[PDB]
Paper text:
DHNTPase catalyzes the hydrolysis of 7,8-dihydroneopterin triphosphate, the product of GTP cyclohydrolase, to 7,8-dihydroneopterin monophosphate and pyrophosphate. The motif RExxEE binds a required metal ion cofactor, presumed physiologically to be Mg2+. To better understand how DHNTPase catalyzes its reaction and drive drug discovery efforts, we solved crystal structures of apo, Co2+-, and Ni2+- bound DHNTPase in a new crystal form.
We solved the respective three ~2 Å resolution structures in space group C2 containing one monomer per asymmetric unit. The main difference between our structures and those previously reported is that there is no shift in loops labeled L2 and L5, which was proposed to be a conformational change needed for catalysis. We suggest that the higher Ka site corresponds to the active site sulfate, and may be a distorted binding site utilizing positively charged Arg29 and/or Lys7 in this region, and the second site is the one stabilized by Trp136 and Arg97 remote from the active site. In silico docking of the substrate DHNTP to apo DHNTPase followed by minor manual adjustment in the metal binding region reveals a binding pose compatible with the metallated structures, its bound sulfate anion, and the previous PPi-bound structures.
Residue numbers in the entry: 5 to 148
Write the structure that this text describes.
């Protein structure tokens, strides 16, 4: 089923250490990222953010009474050529809404759709990802 060109980004980090959680994608093993996912029909960006966090990293924000911060930032970028196949014919642009999720500490992550995870300092995490929007969110909402 086609991914939708409306997505969310959840930058997860540790409040105490400020390290950022980076996940290794299965479709592009050189692509490390925060939590990302499409916004489904009839679902809001915050709803999709909490769903992806629960589906990808097994973190129930409602159960743990965590706070998903709406960054009130939306960006549009070109879908990577080698990844555009998952989108409807003709779709090349993707709009991404940013969210932040500050965990009290670093923790073991049980991922489902990624190959591995790694806690890195904000500058390192930003320099590691291939997504410029993911870099910008870490810099603007974790480093500063």
């Amino acid at each position: 089923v086609y991914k939708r060109p409306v997505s969310i980004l959840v930058v997860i980090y540790a409040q105490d250490t400020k390290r950022v959680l980076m996940l290794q994608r299965r479709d592009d093993p050189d692509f490390w990222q925060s939590v990302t996912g499409s916004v489904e029909e009839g679902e809001t960006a915050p709803q999709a953010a909490m769903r992806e966090v629960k589906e990808e990293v097994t973190i129930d924000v409602v159960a743990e009474q965590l706070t998903l911060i709406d960054c009130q930032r939306t960006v549009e970028f070109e879908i990577f050529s080698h990844l555009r196949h998952r989108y409807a014919p003709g779709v090349t642009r993707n709009t991404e809404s940013w969210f932040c999720l500050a965990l009290p500490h670093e923790r073991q992550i049980v991922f489902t759709e990624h190959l591995a995870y790694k806690w890195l300092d904000a500058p390192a995490a930003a320099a590691l990802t291939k997504s410029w929007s993911n870099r910008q969110a870490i810099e603007q909402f974790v480093i500063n």
